[PDB]
Write a protein that binds this ligand. Structure first.
Ligand SMILES: O=P(O)(O)O[C@@H]1[C@H](O)[C@H](OP(=O)(O)O)[C@@H](O)[C@H](O)[C@H]1O
Lengths: 99, 119
């Protein structure tokens, strides 16, 4: 399902918690209450998961932009020593850009 | 100084760091004219905020705020024994920028942060 594919992707975003360089990070709260600190691309995707569950986007349209975010993130490798992308985050953007 | 002109001043200084010793590596960036520079990690993130400003993603004030935040952290790291002898040009850069009082400079004419020193 398009729906179940989305709930896959945000289960991956959860596990990118604390996978940050020396600088940077994005705080997002769950429905669980738990706060997580995640990379820029993964945060932009988490935001599209919110719009979806808030009836602002369809599953189809949410998943489209999610994949489009991942593809742009995959291309970006401008990172310095102080804000390195972790390998776990790199695999996530590759996986999601595949779909 | 306008915020715009302060940014242009900082980035002229970043360009002069081309080739100078970063002990934690280097970062290639390309100028608008096409020329490629190799600069340290703090200068490179400062350069990236300049780009975000030029693309209209940040205001001049918001760009300078993070530029100065990065130069403060980079200056603190540069005072360590590992780094504080062998990268002087990089040290002077991060020291100048970290000493900018932004909100006072936007009042006025470059204004510096007034503070106590043990001396
Ligand atoms: O905002 P920054 O200071 O650049 O911080 C980096 C970004 O959040 C990166 O997001 P990305 O993977 O989507 O590029 C992340 O992977 C890094 O670990 C952070 O250090």
């Amino acid at each position: 399902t398009a729906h179940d594919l989305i709930d896959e992707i945000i289960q991956d975003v959860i596990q990118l918690d604390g996978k940050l360089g020396l600088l940077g990070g994005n705080t997002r709260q769950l429905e669980d209450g738990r706060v997580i600190n995640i990379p820029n691309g993964a945060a932009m995707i988490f935001d599209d998961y919110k719009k979806y569950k808030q009836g602002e986007l369809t599953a189809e349209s949410a998943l489209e932009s999610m994949i489009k975010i991942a593809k742009l993130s995959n291309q970006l490798n401008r990172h310095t020593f102080f804000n390195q992308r972790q390998p776990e985050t790199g695999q996530f953007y590759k996986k999601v850009a595949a779909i």
